[PDB]
Each structure stands twice: as structure tokens, then as C-alpha cells.
């Protein structure tokens, strides 16, 4: 009984393989001490936020809204160049989205009491994932993209903080560190 | 080439699920399956509205360059948009077309209930194909074909103006390649 | 050879006296000679191991005293000069030969003798002074092995006494062993720097 | 039952001989007190680090990357302390051994063999006889390199010259 | 020039707003009519089922029934204040000075035994109070000389007047609650004593 | 049977064009066969057209094209034509065609009935009968692989020497 | 049917005058048809008198007041006092004619005809067939007059000219 991701480690007890994206990679044993529904919900929320964030990092440097203070190419500096009132409006709109899509159940002890799959916010306007096998494939793809986007957003943000250069532009104008 | 049932237009794509062929202009061309997501009636109403608007648009894009009214002023249609926006007549066009579309929306909602044919406003004052039924489907096919052709043609005329900066009549008589390509180097 | 006439109950040194109770003529070299009662409070295994180790180290030391005074390895005679005996130690400490010897012999003792010491004190089958070092299969015959054991013990005693003698000869006169035996008169002695 | 390696010492009670390289050598008897599996894990990690270090000393002496400056392997340590490459290296070693801690915990629980990370990407060892032979060879090379890396470092410290350089002109002092 | 609601900009903004407001119901109804619920609108992927990472069910949502969130945070803190790191270099279990042949002892093993190692025989307890103050007091028998000395002194006035002289607080509290009145004294109520004193001083 | 020492994956069991059991890494274990064959035919056809076009370009050019593009070929030609707008036109129109290619792949994977690489483009009814069609399938696949390798070769030859195909093979 | 592409409204049976099934926005449903008919008749009558007022005020001015540039501006040149007299007179007329019921709930308590305030002093509405014809004529003329009034008021506001004056002096804006 060994995990697939860590062949030298035993498979975590809570990671039987039924949940999507499961290769037995829980070395620190978070699933033994936290609700796996909560962990999957947090993983999916982080990954979706990071997918949209990487898309924004790639888009803002090429296209910008024709508004005053909205022409900054470096997104880290664009956070401080855009007026803060709009940012707080975005914050409150996303908070309203969080309230609505969770039915007012925000705490770990109440989010899944009413009965809801982790990451299932009732968003499939194309009515995809009716097929179960296609749903499993799409869940694996979504999880892989979520993890890849988390890593990519971290990398792009840190490179922009350090080199003060936006992505792709940094690739074309690769300046090695001093 | 391989045996199997496919669409009449695209031979490597199957016939769409909701394109049975009752509606005119249906050659089984729906690759992305818009008819699978949304109702075919609403899509046909949208198509006919777009097509009629684009028919009138192409006729206008021709005539305005061909002949401008004694009022207003001699100007190309694309900047004439901004000229009439500043003049205020385009707001009135918007108001009257919105008044028509107020009833158009109720017509569309009754189309979803299946009480009227999509795009059928029963507007035949000249009874060109009202008394005869055989001519009606022929004219419907002609209308949908001209609708598609008009949408393509209007998009083409507009995007030809955007890069050529010439009128449609001007371009078919003084045809010049874009960007000075006749004598361009290292383009 | 282990005969009972050179060692054991038969022969008995300082005759007219009684053998110690612990010294029952079982170990090698038991001639019943133990004044001062050292065999009553001291473990015979520890004492025999100490005697064997002292004898072996003294044999090596005496052979070194003889050879160094006659032949020196190339390179050392230029670094140290004509110094020998008790001067070679102080020069080798600064040079590094003595430090290297101390480190290597200490590591060897730590990984060989101390575990052997504790195993043979706690009741192992390893006899004191026995490390099983028998290359070339010397003394495979048990009678020959007993002869070798007694000879090694006696020669170790002789070596210890001779090494003490040579050290004191150098501390008094200031010459090495063969130099001391070829310069018998006590006159014309050089400086013996300690 | 005396030790095979040390004829005058008893074989340690925890060294039955099943492990690779278990010749019975344990004079101080660390295996009598501390867990043998953990000791073999430490031995293998030390030996693997040392083998990589010896190969690195040889290669760095014979070839340095053109975008890196040229210097001896030992005094490059401070150069990469200041530059930050060494921080990256220890960062990634620490990242791997965060999961190494979990591997050690599973080894303590008895659910993993000592030094067995199941890292055989090329599939070199699959036959049991070849696997045992490779285990013996690995442990022997680990010990040899553990000695050799300290040898390289101390020879550089005393002679102020690298390995093949010293083999070029053998200066004795 | 026109501003506010009379401006054409607000006019086309209003028509776009009405377009969205009517886009919600018309396309919601067109969706409800079609829905893509036919048994051919399925997702496709190049990945086969045998690829790792694919779960057994679509949306599993396991029942947790495990340690609380506070206990999980304490576990994450124990990652910091007690990692399983120095527990590796702990003496072996199943070590005792009964199976360990002394004839196999080594430097570390002997040093470990001398430092109180393999002490599995320490199940014995001291079984001594070590705070027990002895209280076995002995009563000296009373002699006839001494029984004649408690007399001739009780008659002389001793034993009366100070009942708590040579007695400690606890000792005097033990008496006057289970008996042992002051010798030479009797018990009388306050009112009766006052009446007797009044009759004694009568006339 | 390609490699005697190893064995083909269970997905490679005949009933496919060009199946000689050559798949040591095991792509067919994790990737659907229809997608793989569609990709193989698309790569093969693209590289066939690319190689033939590179040969023709290095042999004879169009009238008036040298006045604008100059003496630039392969990669320099691409770098100039992206600014010219020719490659923008190619990208737009070929992506427009690949939209229908995409829905074709989707319908194939969900079971419409079409085979990989079958777009129904058979003018003049060439090779549409009997075993000639299967022979043409094998020929197309093998020539596509050959053209793929040849296209890589020509691209890397221009990377190394900076010369076109017909002049690199004659000026060694 | 007024709108051929839409169904006939459920609440428009054809009892009222001028009903041609024109209610795409469906105010006939979700409201009281009698209330809507009375509102339509009142709007029609008010605008019907207002159009005649706009016509008359151009050429005829009462001697007490001073005529403005346009009949729209005739509202401002008259004093604010006297204007509220008209407001209160209209309030009294609308209270007495409606029987002091002024809400959608209490009105039509006796189920009178919508728009029938009992004002027929000349007795023209006696023949029921002529009554229905005049109902149709009144409703159609009110529908025309409301549009006409809403047009002529804005023409007077924009051009600052009287309606006949504008028709005799037509000009662009
Ligand atoms: C004040 C609160 C507190 C308490 C109650 C504990 C309690 C404990 N800690 Mg701990 N810790 C604390 C604060 C605290 N810690 C803080 C503030 C830190 C710094 C962040 C740590 C860092 C820490 C580490 C890194 C480790 C512990 C470990 C332990 C456990 C050791 C018991 C054991 O397994 O025996 C065995 C314990 C031994 C020490 C035996 C090993 C003997 C070897 C041979 C010693 C060799 C010397 C070696 C180099 C360490 C000595 C260093 C010295 C030279 C300076 C014990 C539960 C250890 C453990 O296993 O946790 C489960 C462990 O690895 N703690
Ligand atoms: C009966 C309904 C009605 C009415 C009263 C108006 C009223 C008006 N429209 Mg108008 N309009 C309507 C319906 C109506 N519209 C409809 C249904 C449409 C189609 C969507 C338009 C499209 C429209 C445009 C595009 C413009 C107006 C303009 C005007 C204003 C100018 C009037 C003027 O001075 O011309 C004087 C009138 C005449 C001299 C009479 C003859 C007018 C010409 C010769 C006839 C039309 C010929 C041909 C159809 C065009 C005025 C506010 C203009 C504006 O904004 O004013 C600045 C303007 O540019 N309208
Ligand atoms: C040539 C294009 C064309 C054709 C063939 C049709 C055909 C049709 N339309 Mg139609 N329509 C068109 C353009 C066209 N339309 C445009 C541009 C508009 C926007 C104003 C409309 C708005 C419209 C409405 C609102 C309605 C129709 C309806 C109909 C159908 C019945 C009426 C009929 O017999 O029309 C016969 C039409 C022709 C023979 C074409 C005559 C073209 C003239 C001569 C052009 C004018 C000259 C110009 C200067 C150039 C019929 C299928 C009705 C329907 O859906 O019923 C099913 C309906 O209610 N149409
Ligand atoms: C599939 C890969 C491919 C690609 C990326 C290109 C790309 C290009 N070709 Mg090319 N070509 C191709 C295939 C390809 N061709 C084929 C298969 C042939 C043989 C018919 C040619 C024959 C050809 C000639 C003769 C010329 C180009 C030229 C060019 C360049 C200018 C664009 C143009 O006019 O194209 C024209 C391409 C075609 C007409 C081929 C389309 C027909 C097939 C069926 C597709 C452009 C970089 C021009 C150049 O090099 O400028 C310096 C030029 O003069 N091509
Ligand atoms: C698709 C293939 C193709 C074909 C058949 C032609 C054909 C022609 N080109 Mg041409 N051209 C092509 C692709 C092609 N071009 C491409 C891809 C480019 C972009 C670099 C050009 C750029 C170009 C220029 C710049 C010129 C021509 C010109 C010409 C004409 C020269 C007249 C002659 O010698 O006879 C001829 C009609 C010449 C001309 O007179 O045309 C206006 C001219 O000056 N061409
Ligand atoms: C930009 C528009 C566009 C779009 C949306 C597509 C879409 C597609 N292409 Mg594609 N393609 C395009 C332009 C485009 N093509 C052009 C211009 C070329 C020529 C340079 C190609 C050459 C190409 C090849 C060679 C292949 C695809 C493949 C694919 C498919 C998988 C892509 C994927 O998942 O990654 C998909 C149908 C792959 C496919 O069909 O795999 C089954 C494949 O092998 N395309
Ligand atoms: C010589 C290479 C070659 C061969 C043998 C085939 C063979 C085939 N193709 Mg094909 N194809 C090729 C290249 C080739 N293709 C290229 C390069 C493209 C990209 C444009 C395509 C695009 C394509 C599509 C889109 C389709 C096919 C289809 C087919 C099949 C039926 C049609 C047929 O028999 O054509 C026979 C073809 C030939 C004999 C090639 C003639 C070579 C000419 C003479 C070269 C011209 C000279 C040039 C300058 C050099 C058949 C297996 C159809 C299919 O899959 O059905 C099963 C289909 O829908 N092909
Ligand atoms: C110039 C073209 C017309 C020439 C004017 C000839 C007649 C004068 C009529 C008044 C014009 C038409 C008209 O009545 O305009 C008056 C118009 C009325 O607007 P409101 O004040 O109702 O709008 C305020 C907005 O916030 C909507 O609430 O005021 C405007 O906003 C436009 C102001 C003119 C632009 C000022 C800058
Ligand atoms: C709805 C129709 C209506 C009714 C039923 C009505 C009833 C009565 C009665 C009761 C029988 C009296 C006694 C009375 C008398 C006065 N009326 Mg009325 N009056 C009506 C209409 C107007 C208008 C339009 C105006 C007006 C005014 C005056 C002035 C002048 C005051 C002054 O010169 O300051 C006086 C004295 C003018 C005004 O008040 O402002 C100047 C003016 O503009 N009245 N009015
Ligand atoms: C500190 C520092 C650094 C550093 C560093 C480092 C990494 C220093 C590393 C030093 C090391 C690894 C020394 C190892 C010595 C091993 C010995 C003596 C083994 C002897 C084995 C023997 C004798 C076996 C004997 C035997 C036995 C028992 C068994 C068989 C018999 C026999 C063969 C005889 C840097 C370079 C990073 C720079 C930094 O700025 C400062
Ligand atoms: C449905 C229909 C049937 C067939 C024809 C057609 C197809 C065109 C279709 C469309 C019909 C249409 C578009 C009808 C349009 C009707 C409209 C826009 C009516 C608008 C009327 C506006 C009116 C009263 C304004 C009245 C304002 C009044 C009093 C008071 C003004 C002022 C005065 C002087 C006193 C102080 C207060 C104030 C405001 C300054």
C-alpha cells in the first residue's frame, strides 16, 4: 500500500482514489486532520482565482481599458495605479458573489452541511459534465490547471516584483540578475 | 469518404441534432452546436433580424455614397454615423427602432411559446407570397440567403473602408492595394 | 612450551611461600609470583590484557630504539637531524609525525581494544590479549601456540624492562641504545635534553 | 558467533547480516542502541551526498560553466554564499527533505525500507539478484565516497591546490 | 453638447442596458427549451481512464468525521514545536539487560547501560511515604505517688482558673467538644448564675 | 512488428494504418487513439505541404514577391511576412478552418462515425475505390512521416547554414 | 387584429368602443379594464379640450390677462393665484362627478360605465346605436387628440411659435 505520487510513502488513509486528482500526494497528512471537502473547496477556489489571475497578467500588458490610471503594464504597480475605490468595489462585488454562491454558509462547520460537492457552485452554462466520465476528465483537467496556475501566478508575481518587468516582455528582454 | 451519415454542407460533420431541415436555409451547417444549447426558434428569429438589418445596411452603404439627400451633408457613411450622432437624428432612429423592438420582444416571447413562426411578423402588405404557399417557402429561402449574403457584405464593406479609407463605389473604380504594397520593401 | 615446569602449579617462584588463591596456575606465565597481593583486588582478565598490551608496545618500542639508532628513513633525518630517543618525541610533536601516530593509534585502540576490553571483561570467549591477528597462519598447532604465548609474554616483560633501561640511559648519559653499549664509560656524556 | 569482519569481537545482536554491506563491523555498537533502519537511512543519505560531492569536485575541477567564474570548488562555497546560488541549493534540499521527514516517520513506523525511495526511473534494478548486487555496490561506493570527499577537502585545505592539480605535481609537506 | 438623460450617450447606454435586461429571460428560455440535455452532448477528452489522477466517481464529497479544525491547527503547530526529527535518534525498543549478552557489550552499549539505559526493570516503586512523621505516642502509667500529687493540689486551688494553659489550640479544640470539662468547675446557665449571685447579695 | 525486444501497447493491436507496433514510450496508453491518429495525419499533411512549398520557394518564386520580401527565405521570410500580413491572413483563415476541424474531432470522439483525418475532401473521386483507398492511406501516412522528418531537416539546415534546400544540397 | 403577429389579449373581448385587440404590453391583464377605460377617456377628453385651447390662445386672448409668445408660455404669464383656483375647481369637479370615490378600490362600486360621469345636458346620447357610434368616435378622437397635443406642445416649446404660425412659417431646427 504505497501512494502513486510518493512511491516511498504509504497512501494517505483519506486519499482512497475516489476523489478527482488523487495520486496519493498528501505527505504532511492534511487530509487526516482537515475536512477533505473543505480542502478541495479551498484548492479549487485558489486554482480558479489563479487561472483568472494568470489570464489577467497576460492580458493587461497587451490590452488595457482606456481609462485614466488604467494604462499601467506592470500589474503589481497597476494595483497601486488603479484608484482604490474601484478595487474595493471589486472586493465587495466578489464578497457578494461569495455570499450568494455559498448560500450564506461560509464557515467550515456549515459550508457542506446543506449538501454540496466541493467546488460545485452551480456554474455550467454549457450544461457540460452531464456525462460522468467526461465530468471526471474535466475535473482532472481543472485540478491540473488550478495547480499549474497557482504555481504560474506565484512565479509571474515574484518575477514582476524582482525584475520590475511584465511577463513575455521579460522573455523577449531577458535580463539576468546581477 | 468513409461510410457514415453526415451533414449535407459539411461532409465530415454529422447532421446537427436540432437541425431537422424544416426551417428554410438549413443545410445542416451548425458545427459548434449553437442549436443544441439554445432553441432553434430564438436563433432563427435572431438570424432573420440580423439579416434584415444587414440587408438595409448594405443598401444604405451603397446608396449613401451613391446619393446623399439635399439636407445633411456629403460625407462617407462611417463618419456620417458620428455626424448624425452629434446632429441628434440617430438618437431618434434609436428611439423608433426601440419602440418597434418593444413589440418585437413580445413577439419573440410568444415565439418561445410556439404561437408564431420565428421571424414571422405577418408583414406582407403587397401580398407577394401571402395567398400562395409554394412561393412562400421559396421567398423564405431567398430571404435567408440574402440575409446571410448581406451580413457578410456589410462586414466586408465596413472593413474595406477601415483600411482603405475609400468608398465602396470608390474602391471598385479606383482599386488600390493597402499599405502601399505596390512599392513596399521589407514589409 | 606449556609443560607445568616453566609455568603452572609445579614451578613456584619465591619458594617457601604460598601461591595466591586467585592465581591458580591457569593463565599463561603463572609461576606463583605475586607479592603485594595485586591478584586479589584486580581482575585477572584486565591485568593480563594490560600485561600483553604493555609487552607488545614495549617490544615495538625497543625495536624502534635499536633501529632508529642504526638506520633512519630518508627525509626524517633531514627534518630531525641527529636527535633520537627522548628528543625525537618533542621534535615529532611539532613536525606532525607524533600527532599522526597518536591519532591513528588512538583510533585503532578505540575501535579495537575498548570493545574487546569490555567484551572480555563481561565474559566473552575472547581471551585477554587475543585479537585473532594470525596472518600467514603462524602457530596453528596448539602446543606451538602455547609455546608462542609463553614466549611472547616473557619477551614482553623483557622488552618493558629494557625500554625503561634505555630511557633512563638516555636521560642520564644522552645516547641511544647501541651508542650507549659502544660508549660504556660514563664520561664524555652529551647533553640529554628531555 | 563472532563478527565476520572483526574476528575478536562478538557480532552485534542487531546485525543479522540481511542488510547490504552488513559485514558485522560495529565496534562502538551504535546499532545496539539506536534503530538500525534509521542508521541505514542516515548512512545512505550521507553516502549519496558524498558520491555526488566527489563527482562534483572532479567535474568542477575539470570543467566550470562558462557563465560562472572560474575558481576552486572549495572556495566557491563562500562565493555562492554571497551570490545566492548556495541559498537556492539548500532551499531545494530543504524542500525535498521536508518530505524526507515524512519518509523518516514512515520508516520509524516500519512501513518503508531504509533508504528505499523507490527511485528507479531507468529500471536498472528489477531482478532480485541484480538488486542485491546493486545494493552492495551502492553501499560500498557510498562509504568510499564518504571517505574521499573529506579527503579532497582536507587535502585542498592543507595544500591549497585541487585534486588533479595535486596529482599533477605531488608536493609533500 | 446635450448632457445627462438628453445625451445620446445615455441613450445608447440605455438601449444596451435594455438589451442585457431582455437577454436574461429570452436566452434563459431558449436554454430551457434546448438545455443541451440530449444524450449526445457529452464532453470529450484525449485522456484515457487509465491515466493517473482520475478518480473513481465524479463528485465524491467524502464524509469527514475526523479531528476538528482546532486540532488540525494544533497539528500544524506540532509541525513546528515537535517535528518527528530527534525521535529518530532515540534508543531502540525491546532493549533490556536480560537478553543483551554482557559478553557482547561495546563502548556505546556500556556507556548506555551506565547512564541508566534499557531501564525496563524500573517498574518497582519506592513504596515509602518519605513524609510520614511518626505519631506513636506512649502514655506513661500513673503511679500512686502522683495520684497523691494530683490530690493535695486540686484541693489547694490548682487545675482551676486557666483551663487552656498548657494546651495547644488544636489540643484545646479537641476537648471542650467531646467532654473533659475543667476540673473543679460545674456547668450552669447565665440566668441561673445571675439569680444565684443576686440571692447571695440579698439584703 | 517493429522492435523485437519490446511489445506494442494494447491499443496497438492492428486494425489501423501504419501499425507496426512502434510505441515504446506508451502514448496510446494515456491518449485516445482517434486523437493520436488525427494529430498524426494533421502533422503529416501540414509537413507535406510545408516541404513541397519550401522546395518550390527555393526553386521559383511568384512575380513581384521579391520586390517586397527581398532575398529572405524560411525564417527571415516568416519574420518579414508576419509584418507584411500574409502570415496573419494564413493564421486567421487556417484557424477558421480549424474551428470546423475542432468540431470534427469532438464529434469523432463522442461517436459521430468519422475516422481520424477524414475531412471528406476527395475531388475528382481520386482513390475512393477498393484497396486503392487503403493503399493511399498507407502511402499518405508514410509520406507524411517522411515529410515531417524532411521539414525538420530543412528548418535545421537553414538554422545552421542559412541556405535554402536546393542550394544547401548542391553547395556542401 | 391590430397586431397580427401577436395573440389577442385575453381581457379584450370587444365590449368597449375602439377595442381592436391592441395591448401587446398587456395592461389589460393585471389591472382593472374599467379603470383603464376611464383613464383613457379622461386623458382623451383633457387633450381634446387642450388642442382646442392651443388653437384658440393664438388668436383670442382674454382681456384680463396678457398674451405670451406661445400658448405654452401663456401658462407662465398668468398669475400663480388664479391658477390654483383652476386646480381647486378641477378638484371639486372630479370629486363631485365621481361621487367622492377617488381610488381604484372604491370607484365603480355601483359598476357604472367607465367614463360615464352623467354629463349629458343636451341629451345627445339617447339612441343606443348612435350612442355606440359616438362612443367609438369619442374614443378615436381622444386617441388622436392625445398624440396631437403631445406633439403641438413640444413643437411650441422647441420652435417658440404657434402651431398655425409654425405651419405658415415652417423651418428647420
Ligand atoms: C516549550 C515547549 C516544548 C515542549 C514541551 C517540547 C517537547 C518536545 N519536543 Mg520540541 N521544540 C520547542 C518547544 C518544545 N518542545 C521549540 C520552541 C522548538 C524550536 C522551534 C522545538 C523544536 C523541536 C525539534 C526540532 C524536535 C523537538 C522534539 C520534541 C520532543 C522530544 C521528545 C522525544 O521524542 O524524545 C527524543 C528526544 C531527543 C532529544 C533524543 C535525541 C537524542 C540525540 C542523540 C541528541 C543528540 C544531540 C542533538 C544534535 C540535539 C542536541 C542539540 C544541542 C547540542 C544544542 C518533545 C515532545 C523532537 C521530536 O522528536 O519531536 C517529536 C524534535 O526532533 N522539538
Ligand atoms: C411622425 C413621427 C415623427 C415625427 C413627428 C418626427 C419628428 C422629428 N424627426 Mg423623426 N423619425 C421618425 C418619426 C418621426 N420623427 C421615424 C419613424 C424615423 C425613422 C427611425 C425618424 C428618423 C429621424 C432622423 C434620422 C432624423 C429625424 C429628425 C426629426 C426632427 C426634425 C423635424 C424637422 O425639422 O423636419 C422638417 C420636416 C420637413 C421639412 C418635412 C419633410 C421631411 C423630409 C423631406 C421627408 C423625409 C424624406 C426621407 C424619408 C428621409 C423632428 C423632431 C431629424 C432630427 O434629429 O432633427 C435635427 C433627423 O435627423 N427623424
Ligand atoms: C429581397 C429580400 C427579401 C425577401 C425575398 C423577403 C421575403 C419575405 N419577407 Mg421580408 N424583409 C426584407 C427583405 C426581404 N424579405 C427586409 C430588408 C426587411 C426589413 C424592412 C423585411 C421585413 C419583413 C417583415 C417585417 C416580414 C417579412 C416577411 C417576408 C415573407 C413574406 C412577405 C413576402 O412575400 O415578401 C416578398 C418579398 C420580395 C419579393 C422582395 C422584394 C424586394 C423589394 C422589391 C426591394 C425594394 C427595392 C429596393 C430599393 C432595392 C417573405 C418570405 C413577412 C414574414 O416573415 O412572413 C413569413 C414579415 O412579416 N419581411
Ligand atoms: C504549407 C506550408 C506553407 C507555408 C507556411 C507557406 C508560406 C509562404 N509561401 Mg508557400 N507554398 C506552399 C506551402 C506553404 N507556403 C506550397 C505547398 C507551395 C507549392 C504550390 C508553395 C509555393 C509558393 C511560392 C511559389 C511562393 C510561396 C511564397 C510563400 C510566402 C508568401 C505567402 C504566399 O504567397 O504563399 C503562396 C503559397 C501558395 C500559393 C500555396 C497555396 C497552395 C497549396 C495547395 C496550399 C509565405 C511565407 C512566396 C514566397 O516565398 O515569397 C518570397 C512565393 O513566391 N509559396
Ligand atoms: C499568389 C501568387 C501571385 C501572383 C500570381 C502574382 C502576380 C503578380 N504580381 Mg504579385 N505578389 C504576391 C503573389 C502573387 N503575385 C505576393 C504574395 C506578394 C507579397 C510580397 C506580391 C507582391 C507584389 C508586388 C509588390 C508587385 C506584384 C506584381 C505582380 C504582377 C506582375 C505583372 C507581371 O509580371 O505579369 C502580377 C499580376 C507587380 C504589379 O504590377 O502588381 C500591381 C508589383 O509591383 N506582386
Ligand atoms: C489559431 C487558430 C487555430 C485553432 C483554434 C486550432 C485548433 C486546433 N488545432 Mg490547429 N493549426 C492552426 C490554427 C488553429 N488550430 C494553424 C494555422 C496551423 C498551421 C501552422 C495549425 C496546425 C495544427 C496541427 C499540426 C495540429 C493542430 C491541432 C489542433 C487541435 C488541437 C489544438 C490543441 O488542443 O492544442 C484543434 C482542433 C492538432 C490536432 O488536430 O490534434 C488532434 C494538431 O496535431 N493544428
Ligand atoms: C501524396 C500524398 C497524399 C496521399 C497519397 C493522400 C491520400 C489520401 N488523402 Mg490526402 N492530403 C495530402 C496528401 C496526400 N493524401 C495533403 C498534403 C493534404 C493537405 C492539403 C491532404 C488533405 C486531405 C484531406 C483533407 C482529405 C484527404 C483524403 C485522402 C484519402 C482520399 C483521397 C485520395 O485518395 O487522394 C489521393 C491523393 C493523391 C494521389 C495525391 C496526389 C499528389 C499530387 C499529384 C501532388 C501534386 C504535385 C505537387 C506540386 C508535388 C487518401 C487516403 C480524404 C480522406 O481522409 O479520406 C479518407 C480527405 O478528406 N487528404
Ligand atoms: C443647439 C441645438 C438647439 C438650439 C436651441 C434652440 C431652442 C432652445 C431649446 C432648448 C434645447 C433643447 C433642450 O430643451 O435642452 C434642455 C435640456 C434639458 O435637460 P434636463 O436639464 O432635463 O437634463 C438634465 C439631465 O441630467 C437629465 O435629468 O438641457 C440639457 O441637458 C441640454 C442643455 C443644452 C446643452 C448645455 C451644455
Ligand atoms: C377655475 C375657474 C375659476 C373659478 C371657479 C373662479 C372662482 C372665483 C370666484 C368665486 C365665485 C371669485 C369671487 C373669483 C374672483 C377672482 N378670481 Mg377667480 N375663478 C376662476 C379662474 C380665475 C383665474 C384664472 C384668475 C382668477 C382670478 C380672480 C381674481 C383676481 C384677483 C386679483 O386681481 O388679484 C378674483 C377677484 C385671477 C387671480 O386670482 O389672479 C390675478 C386670475 O388669474 N380666477 N374667482
Ligand atoms: C566546514 C567548511 C566546509 C566544509 C566541509 C566539509 C564537508 C568537511 C567534511 C569533512 C569530512 C567529510 C571529513 C571526513 C573524514 C573521514 C574520515 C577521517 C574517515 C576515516 C575512515 C577511516 C580511517 C577508516 C578506517 C578503517 C576502518 C575503521 C574500517 C576498515 C579498516 C580501516 C580502513 C582502517 C566547506 C568546504 C563547506 C567550506 C566552509 O567555509 C567551511
Ligand atoms: C402605437 C402606435 C399606433 C399607430 C401609429 C404608430 C405606429 C406610430 C404607433 C406609435 C404611436 C406613438 C409613438 C405615440 C407617441 C405619443 C407621445 C410621445 C406622447 C407624449 C406626450 C407628452 C405630453 C402630453 C406632455 C405634456 C406636458 C404638459 C401638459 C405640461 C407642460 C408644462 C406646462 C406649460 C405647465 C408647467 C409644467 C410644464 C411641464 C413645464
Numbering used by the authors:
A (entry chain 9): 45 to 222
B (entry chain p): 32 to 218
C (entry chain 7): 42 to 235
D (entry chain 8): 44 to 216
E (entry chain s): 83 to 285
F (entry chain 0): 53 to 224
G (entry chain P): 47 to 219
Tell me what the authors wrote about this structure, in their words.
Photosystem II (PSII) of cryptophyte algae associates with alloxanthin chlorophyll a/c-binding proteins (ACPs) to act as the peripheral light-harvesting system, whose supramolecular organization is unknown. The PSII supercomplex consists of a homodimeric reaction center core and peripheral antenna protein subunits, where the peripheral antennas absorb light energy and transfer them to the PSII core to initiate charge separation in the primary electron donor P680, a special pair of chlorophylls (Chls). In this work, we isolate the PSII-ACPII supercomplex from a cryptophyte alga C. placoidea and solve its structure using single-particle cryo-electron microscopy (cryo-EM). In addition, a special Chl a-binding antenna subunit was identified and named as cryptophyte Chl a-binding special protein (CCPII-S) in each PSII-ACPII monomer.
Targeted local refinement was conducted to increase the resolution of the cryo-EM density maps for the peripheral ACPIIs, leading to a final local resolution of 2.84 Å for the peripheral antennas of PSII-ACPII. The high-quality cryo-EM density and sequence characteristics of the ACPII protein isoforms allow us to model the six ACPIIs as antennas encoded by the lhcr genes rather than by the lhcz genes in the structure, and they are named as ACPII-1/2/3/4/5/6. All ACPII antenna subunits consist of three transmembrane helices (αA, αB, αC), a short amphipathic helix αE between αA and αB, and a short amphipathic helix αD at their C-terminal ends, which are similar to those of LHCs from red algae, green algae, diatoms and higher plants. However, structural comparison of the six ACPII subunits reveals remarkable differences in the lengths and orientations of the N and C terminuses. ACPII-2, ACPII-3, and ACPII-6 have similar C-terminal lengths. These structural differences may be a result of the specific position that each antenna subunit occupies, thus contributing to the distinct arrangement and stable assembly of the ACPIIs in the PSII-ACPII supercomplex. Each ACPII subunit binds 9 to 12 Chls a, and most of the binding sites of Chl a are conserved across the six ACPII subunits, with the exception of a613 and a614 specific to ACPII-1 and ACPII-4, respectively, and a606 missing in ACPII-3/6. In addition, ACPII-1/2/4/5/6 each also binds 1–2 Chls c, whereas ACPII-3 does not bind any Chl c and a Chl a molecule is found in the binding site corresponding to c610. In addition to the large amounts of Chls, each ACPII subunit binds 3–4 Alx molecules. CCPII-S is a distinct antenna subunit consisting of a single N-terminal transmembrane helix and an extended C-terminus, with a total molecular weight of around 24 kDa. In addition, two Chl a molecules, Chl a601 and Chl a602, are identified in CCPII-S.
